[PDB]
Design a protein around this motif. Structure first.
Motif, PDB file in Angstrom:
ATOM      1  N   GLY A 155       0.900  -1.500   0.108  1.00  0.00           N
ATOM      2  CA  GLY A 155      -0.068  -0.020   0.060  1.00  0.00           C
ATOM      3  C   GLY A 155       0.627   1.195  -0.007  1.00  0.00           C
ATOM      4  N   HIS A 213      -3.356  -4.949  -1.676  1.00  0.00           N
ATOM      5  CA  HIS A 213      -2.470  -3.728  -1.516  1.00  0.00           C
ATOM      6  C   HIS A 213      -1.151  -3.787  -1.859  1.00  0.00           C
ATOM      7  N   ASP A 228       1.807  -4.187  -4.387  1.00  0.00           N
ATOM      8  CA  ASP A 228       2.341  -3.881  -5.592  1.00  0.00           C
ATOM      9  C   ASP A 228       3.636  -3.224  -5.704  1.00  0.00           C
ATOM     10  N   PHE A 229       4.486  -3.177  -6.718  1.00  0.00           N
ATOM     11  CA  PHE A 229       5.681  -2.488  -6.629  1.00  0.00           C
ATOM     12  C   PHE A 229       5.968  -1.117  -5.920  1.00  0.00           C
ATOM     13  N   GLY A 267       8.551  -0.264 -10.490  1.00  0.00           N
ATOM     14  CA  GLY A 267       7.284   0.228 -10.152  1.00  0.00           C
ATOM     15  C   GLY A 267       7.273   1.343 -11.316  1.00  0.00           C
TER      16      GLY A 267
END
Lengths: 50, 65, 121, 437, 171
Positions: free
Chosen positions: E126, E144, E146-147, E154
């Motif tokens: 997050g 929540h 992700d990179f 990202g």
RNA sequence: CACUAUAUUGCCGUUGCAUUUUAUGGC
């Protein structure tokens, strides 16, 4: 032999259209013709790019 | 571009002093340069860089705030 | 018992559509009628979903005869555009199939959905 | 006198108090509006953002730069934003300036943050024109957002979202400012300063695609994500949120009815607006319209299926049998009826009124009660045959006498997917209703 | 940590081999840590079973315990009774750690690649960058992950090797 | 800002001028 590039993709279009038509007139217990007619109009409007 | 916010602004006329917890958000800078952030804090308040004073900083883990 | 018999009510429709959405985001969902029957006779299909307002209905009604042969559960939902929005894709799908995968993060939700639809049938 | 004291309070002190004050519910006749359609042939228009110059912006020095005319900005799906003059009421919105995006706006690095190319890849989604009238931001499925100049529409700057899947889905300006809350579909909400041309803060914590956002004067944001049946209210300056869920199940609604009638569960929250800083309204995927406060989690007042239910398919294209009895039975009664899930909604800020739109061909206008816990119809606006992507209301007149222009962008498919069910004769255009008193 | 009673059994050795193998662990101490907290959680769960039903001690602390375990996610909400906490086991505990959870979420393609890109500070839950495998993501924060924003996976700048090789290709 | 001043719709079907005008329905 049957299903008479520019011929290849229209052969695939006719193939899955007639598989869909086969599903219709098999599983419908007493089939009609109107969906076959609209499939015919669809595939002829598709090949009318040429 | 950074954004400095303040929170729990409680006044204290026992020292004529307005105290708070400040939190800066710098998305890509390393740190916020105590002098530079205190003069920007004096700008967003009434006045006097020399009379504003911020002292208890720490950068949280992973950076950013 | 008209033709598309195990038609889900509103709450079960909504929970199978949200598990469809997270399966599609996890890339565990294969969509469409012929990709559905392809994964059905591959054998990796946990349960299948069919939209029972398609034009006409037989184009997916071919799928019960394969799925109840190969013993996977099958549900109907009331709307193609609902299934399309829940698949996360621009055109209305009418058939959808969850590939079996033990490396999934949605496995318990999949199994709870499966138990509810098997008690539905 | 006392009336001039009251008018000076209602100048600004009511709106900085931040409660609904501008009451014109019963004051507003509806059923005789000038309901002009305008056709624009640019392939599924998807947004409307009007801009009126506010006079004497909380001090004096009337407005910002012409001198005093309104605007509107609009967005196609084939990559063309268009700037319309709207200032001449009881006249059609005239097209003024144009900007397209082609394939040549695809970069060549293609695999990093740099989407520095000024136009658009594809599928521009929505705009927002800044309240100081210098810029209009635009943003779509190409993971950018652009500041256009409001005069020559020249790419001032391009702001990439810096993401693999950060499609920008709705933008909103905090009013009388140039802070911009963009709602990016990697579950996040971004904040930008336009005059600094930069990104203040990114704020996480949602749960699915945050497909609609709204904001008002103070630092609130109200966003809804789709397939989580929730609505987040972000308060920035303390950095926290509030999660208002749905929770209307059909068996309990049957318990509420069974004292003496079809309704169904909730797919997804779709659209938001906020009527003050203390109540907001949302529109869901089951047609439900929720009116919500700060203090409670459940709906205060949820109107039911708002725009009615979609018509069932015919005998002729449901089964392909020949006998009408079997093609009747294939309809399964009313069981596969699905609602007109609404597609845009707008509340005039601090007003007694809001409006809702879907592809029922007709806008629906609603008035909140005086005690702010109920709302009801006001009329019907039928010239907008098609899907309503976004509604914005612009105003004119005196301190008490009003002259409104409703601008509803109309397309023939939904602004995200394609998803039609035989939409019957939808011209791509703008519905524009002059409504007075 | 906690050591076993008889640690050198071939059954326990094959146990530790299988768990460490298919969950990507670094020694047996990780297994022993979460096995110790599993042991204390069901040893605190069984005496509440042995005491009487509707003893308010049992009622309140059992609802407390299963409210914690549902939120961690080791106990599905269809089984909201205390004997299912007895039925719980340790692979459910190391299924919820961040390494295995991100590998189930995709974006990692192998469990040890999941561990190593967590440790390269690439993954944020997050808002917060997390560089530890043994994290136990809760059921709300499952979706929540992700990179990180400041990661080349990202949307940040390309990394060291990327810009060094881009400079040498500019040469 | 001061100048220089240059002199309804992507396609298809329409009310209506003493050329505009005007709101409809097909892709």
């Amino acid at each position: 032999g049957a299903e008479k590039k520019n011929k290849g993709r229209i052969s695939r279009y006719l193939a899955n259209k007639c598989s869909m038509a086969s599903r219709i007139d098999n599983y419908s217990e007493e089939p009609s013709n109107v969906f076959g007619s609209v499939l015919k109009k669809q595939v002829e409007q598709r090949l009318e790019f040429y | 571009a950074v954004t400095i916010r303040t929170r729990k602004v409680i006044s204290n006329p026992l020292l004529a002093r307005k105290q708070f917890v400040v939190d800066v958000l710098h998305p890509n800078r390393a740190n916020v340069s105590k002098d530079e952030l205190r003069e920007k804090l004096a700008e967003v308040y009434k006045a006097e860089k020399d009379a504003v004073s911020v002292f208890g900083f720490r950068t949280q883990f992973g950076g950013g705030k | 018992n008209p033709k598309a018999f195990p038609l889900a009510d509103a709450a079960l429709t909504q929970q199978i559509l949200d598990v469809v959405q997270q399966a599609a985001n996890l890339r565990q969902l294969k969509k469409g009628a012929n990709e559905a029957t392809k994964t059905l006779n591959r054998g990796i299909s946990e349960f299948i979903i069919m939209a029972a307002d398609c034009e006409p209905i037989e184009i997916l009604l071919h799928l019960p005869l394969l799925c109840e042969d190969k013993n996977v559960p099958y549900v109907f939902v009331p709307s193609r555009v609902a299934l399309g929005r829940a698949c996360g894709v621009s055109r209305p799908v009418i058939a959808a199939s969850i590939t079996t995968n033990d490396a999934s993060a949605i496995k318990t939700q999949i199994y709870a959905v499966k138990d509810k639809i098997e008690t539905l049938l | 006198d006392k009336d001039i004291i009251a008018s000076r309070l209602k100048e600004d002190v009511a709106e900085q108090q931040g409660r609904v004050f501008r009451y014109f519910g019963d004051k507003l006749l509806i059923s005789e509006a000038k309901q002009s359609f305008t056709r624009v042939g640019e392939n599924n228009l998807t947004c409307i953002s009007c801009f009126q110059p506010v006079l004497n912006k909380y001090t004096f020095e009337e407005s910002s730069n012409n001198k005093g005319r309104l605007f509107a900005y609009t967005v196609s799906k084939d990559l063309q934003l268009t700037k319309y003059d709207i200032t001449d009421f009881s006249k059609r919105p005239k097209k003024l300036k144009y900007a397209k995006g082609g394939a040549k706006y695809i970069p060549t690095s293609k695999h990093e943050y740099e989407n520095t190319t000024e136009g658009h890849y594809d599928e521009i989604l929505t705009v927002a024109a800044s309240p100081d009238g210098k810029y209009v931001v635009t943003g779509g499925r190409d993971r950018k957002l652009i500041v256009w100049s409001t005069e020559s529409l020249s790419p001032v700057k391009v702001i990439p979202t810096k993401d693999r899947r950060g499609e920008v889905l709705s933008l909103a300006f905090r009013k009388n400012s140039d802070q911009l809350y963009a709602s990016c579909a990697d579950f996040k909400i971004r904040t930008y300063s336009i005059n600094q041309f930069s990104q203040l803060e990114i704020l996480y914590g949602h749960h699915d695609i945050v497909e609609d956002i709204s904001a008002l004067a103070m630092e609130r944001c109200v966003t809804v994500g789709a397939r989580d049946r929730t609505a987040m209210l972000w308060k920035i300056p303390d950095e926290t949120r509030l999660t208002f869920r749905g929770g209307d199940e059909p068996q309990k609604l049957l318990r509420r009815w069974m004292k003496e009638p079809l309704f169904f569960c909730e797919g997804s929250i779709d659209v938001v607006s906020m009527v003050d800083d203390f109540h907001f309204i949302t529109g869901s995927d089951n047609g439900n319209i929720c009116l919500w406060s700060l203090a409670k989690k459940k709906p205060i007042f949820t109107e039911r299926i708002a725009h009615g239910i979609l018509p069932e398919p015919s005998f002729n294209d449901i089964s392909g049998e020949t006998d009408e009895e079997l093609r009747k039975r294939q309809l399964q009664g009313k069981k596969l009826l699905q609602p007109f899930w609404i597609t845009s909604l707008y509340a005039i800020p601090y007003s007694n009124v809001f409006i809702s739109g879907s592809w029922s061909g007709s806008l629906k206008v609603w008035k909140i009660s005086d005690n702010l816990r109920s709302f009801e119809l006001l009329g019907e606006l039928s010239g907008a045959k098609g899907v309503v992507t976004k509604i914005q209301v612009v105003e004119s007149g005196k301190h008490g006498k009003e002259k409104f222009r409703i601008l509803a962008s109309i397309a023939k498919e939904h602004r995200l997917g394609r998803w039609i069910a035989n939409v019957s004769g939808a011209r791509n255009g703008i519905y524009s209703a002059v409504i007075d008193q | 940590y906690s050591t076993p009673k008889r640690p050198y059994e071939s059954s326990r050795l094959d146990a530790e081999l299988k768990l460490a193998g298919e969950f990507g662990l670094k020694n047996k101490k990780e297994i022993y840590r979460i096995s110790f907290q599993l042991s204390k959680i069901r040893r605190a769960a069984r005496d509440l079973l042995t005491r009487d039903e509707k003893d308010p001690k049992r009622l309140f602390e059992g609802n407390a315990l299963i409210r914690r375990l549902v939120r961690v996610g080791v106990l599905s909400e269809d089984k909201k009774k205390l004997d299912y906490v007895l039925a719980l086991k340790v692979e459910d505990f190391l299924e919820r750690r961040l390494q295995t959870q991100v590998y189930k979420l995709g974006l990692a393609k192998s469990v040890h690649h999941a561990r190593v890109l967590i440790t390269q500070r690439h993954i944020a839950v997050g808002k917060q960058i997390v560089n530890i495998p043994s994290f136990m993501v809760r059921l709300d924060s499952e979706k929540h992950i992700d990179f990180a924003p400041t990661s080349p996976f990202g949307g940040a700048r390309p990394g060291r090797v990327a810009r060094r090789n881009a400079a040498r290709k500019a040469e």
